[PDB]
Design an enzyme around this catalytic site. Sequence first.
Site, mmCIF file in Angstrom:
data_model
loop_
_atom_site.group_PDB
_atom_site.id
_atom_site.type_symbol
_atom_site.label_atom_id
_atom_site.label_comp_id
_atom_site.label_asym_id
_atom_site.label_seq_id
_atom_site.Cartn_x
_atom_site.Cartn_y
_atom_site.Cartn_z
ATOM 1 N N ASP A 1 0.733 -1.304 -0.051
ATOM 2 C CA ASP A 1 0.057 0.094 -0.168
ATOM 3 C C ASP A 1 0.769 1.207 -0.018
ATOM 4 O O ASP A 1 1.074 1.622 1.016
ATOM 5 C CB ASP A 1 -1.030 0.035 1.353
ATOM 6 C CG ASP A 1 -1.904 1.072 1.047
ATOM 7 O OD1 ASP A 1 -1.990 2.077 0.409
ATOM 8 O OD2 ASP A 1 -2.909 0.981 2.267
ATOM 9 N N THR A 2 1.200 1.829 -1.146
ATOM 10 C CA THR A 2 1.906 2.890 -1.251
ATOM 11 C C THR A 2 1.473 4.172 -0.648
ATOM 12 O O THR A 2 1.969 4.957 -0.736
ATOM 13 C CB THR A 2 2.356 3.178 -2.852
ATOM 14 O OG1 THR A 2 1.378 3.238 -3.528
ATOM 15 C CG2 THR A 2 3.218 1.947 -3.313
ATOM 16 N N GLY A 3 0.144 4.120 -0.591
ATOM 17 C CA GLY A 3 -0.829 5.291 0.343
ATOM 18 C C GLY A 3 -0.775 5.440 1.594
ATOM 19 O O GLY A 3 -1.043 6.343 2.081
HETATM 20 C C1 LIG Z 1 -4.240 13.171 5.971
HETATM 21 C C2 LIG Z 1 -5.324 14.189 6.898
HETATM 22 O O1 LIG Z 1 -6.172 13.207 7.325
HETATM 23 P P1 LIG Z 1 -5.784 11.524 8.108
HETATM 24 O O2 LIG Z 1 -4.317 11.737 8.532
HETATM 25 C C3 LIG Z 1 -5.756 10.396 6.781
HETATM 26 O O3 LIG Z 1 -5.053 10.651 5.693
HETATM 27 C C4 LIG Z 1 -5.176 9.571 4.611
HETATM 28 C C5 LIG Z 1 -6.348 8.598 4.226
HETATM 29 C C6 LIG Z 1 -6.351 7.479 3.528
HETATM 30 C C7 LIG Z 1 -4.974 7.346 2.404
HETATM 31 C C8 LIG Z 1 -5.037 6.079 1.606
HETATM 32 C C9 LIG Z 1 -5.172 4.964 2.321
HETATM 33 N N1 LIG Z 1 -3.959 5.045 3.315
HETATM 34 C C10 LIG Z 1 -4.099 4.608 4.777
HETATM 35 O O4 LIG Z 1 -4.970 4.223 5.138
HETATM 36 O O5 LIG Z 1 -2.588 4.810 5.556
HETATM 37 C C11 LIG Z 1 -2.806 4.820 7.013
HETATM 38 C C12 LIG Z 1 -2.009 3.967 7.605
HETATM 39 O O6 LIG Z 1 -0.660 4.588 7.563
HETATM 40 C C13 LIG Z 1 -1.141 6.193 7.411
HETATM 41 O O7 LIG Z 1 -0.544 6.671 6.329
HETATM 42 C C14 LIG Z 1 -1.999 7.552 5.862
HETATM 43 C C15 LIG Z 1 -2.844 7.302 6.516
HETATM 44 C C16 LIG Z 1 -2.713 6.345 7.516
HETATM 45 C C17 LIG Z 1 -4.813 3.603 1.430
HETATM 46 O O8 LIG Z 1 -3.620 3.728 0.786
HETATM 47 C C18 LIG Z 1 -5.976 3.551 0.591
HETATM 48 N N2 LIG Z 1 -7.315 3.078 1.463
HETATM 49 C C19 LIG Z 1 -7.630 1.536 1.334
HETATM 50 C C20 LIG Z 1 -6.658 0.494 2.284
HETATM 51 C C21 LIG Z 1 -6.813 0.710 3.576
HETATM 52 C C22 LIG Z 1 -7.296 -0.931 1.890
HETATM 53 C C23 LIG Z 1 -8.638 -1.206 3.046
HETATM 54 S S1 LIG Z 1 -8.424 4.147 1.596
HETATM 55 O O9 LIG Z 1 -7.946 5.329 1.781
HETATM 56 O O10 LIG Z 1 -9.435 3.735 2.695
HETATM 57 C C24 LIG Z 1 -9.511 3.803 -0.015
HETATM 58 C C25 LIG Z 1 -10.342 2.612 -0.366
HETATM 59 C C26 LIG Z 1 -11.249 2.539 -1.305
HETATM 60 C C27 LIG Z 1 -10.939 3.300 -2.560
HETATM 61 N N3 LIG Z 1 -11.824 3.241 -3.870
HETATM 62 C C28 LIG Z 1 -9.949 4.474 -2.345
HETATM 63 C C29 LIG Z 1 -9.324 4.836 -1.122
HETATM 64 C C30 LIG Z 1 -3.938 8.214 2.557
HETATM 65 C C31 LIG Z 1 -3.789 9.641 3.811
HETATM 66 O O11 LIG Z 1 -6.711 11.287 9.343
HETATM 67 C C32 LIG Z 1 -7.986 12.047 9.430
HETATM 68 C C33 LIG Z 1 -9.014 11.758 8.133
#
Ligand SMILES: CCOP(=O)(COc1ccc(C[C@H](NC(=O)O[C@H]2CO[C@H]3OCC[C@H]32)[C@H](O)CN(C[C@@H](C)CC)S(=O)(=O)c2ccc(N)cc2)cc1)OCC
Lengths: 99, 99
Positions: free
Chosen positions: B25-27
Amino acid sequence: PQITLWKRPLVTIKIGGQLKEALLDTGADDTVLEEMNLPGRWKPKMIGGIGGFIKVRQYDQILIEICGHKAIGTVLVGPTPVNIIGRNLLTQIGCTLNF
Amino acid sequence: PQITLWKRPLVTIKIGGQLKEALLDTGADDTVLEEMNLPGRWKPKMIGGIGGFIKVRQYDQILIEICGHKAIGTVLVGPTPVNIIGRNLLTQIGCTLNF
Ligand SMILES: CCOP(=O)(COc1ccc(C[C@H](NC(=O)O[C@H]2CO[C@H]3OCC[C@H]32)[C@H](O)CN(C[C@@H](C)CC)S(=O)(=O)c2ccc(N)cc2)cc1)OCC
């Protein structure tokens, strides 16, 4: 190009005539963009991740340019904290993971 | 190997002597694994996703083998929908995005 993962893989995209920064996210099934007023029809949708679900608007066959590579497909729009390019469009630009 | 994104980039990992399926998960900034028992001390932390924040247990300097590649880093454990391998470990196995 090749993108290392020391930092968040943020790139410039072009959608609906607007330029934006988005995260290349192999963990995202579909592309979800920050709130924006796109024209055309849409369908309600819910997508889940860490923390639960958010409601988004699904627009189909939307053209986005990612680093000069054109890609057209589903784009979700909703209260996301970040612009996220998901696998549905990453495949169209020939993006792979390599190690 | 080179991994395409037409399907979810799921791989087999080995942590605490146990095998699991995890998403590259590069995100994700950090690695978050589903509820499990791990030895050693830990600190309670919180991470935010698309749906909000969750409570996790932070395990530091944890040995984890990802698709045959060893890594030793921070592993969060909590109610995540899926085992995700974040950039903190993807960098250790030499993972890059390429298009
Ligand atoms: C930044 C200010 O707000 P914020 O800090 C969160 O910002 C964010 C929020 C989301 C991401 C992207 C997601 N990354 C993530 O969950 O990473 C977590 C753990 O490591 C930290 O790294 C940053 C976050 C923490 C992931 O790649 C993709 N996901 C699915 C994965 C989980 C498979 C189930 S999906 O997004 O749910 C998603 C699902 C379906 C579809 N069609 C499109 C997207 C990156 C930064 O909190 C308060 C809102």
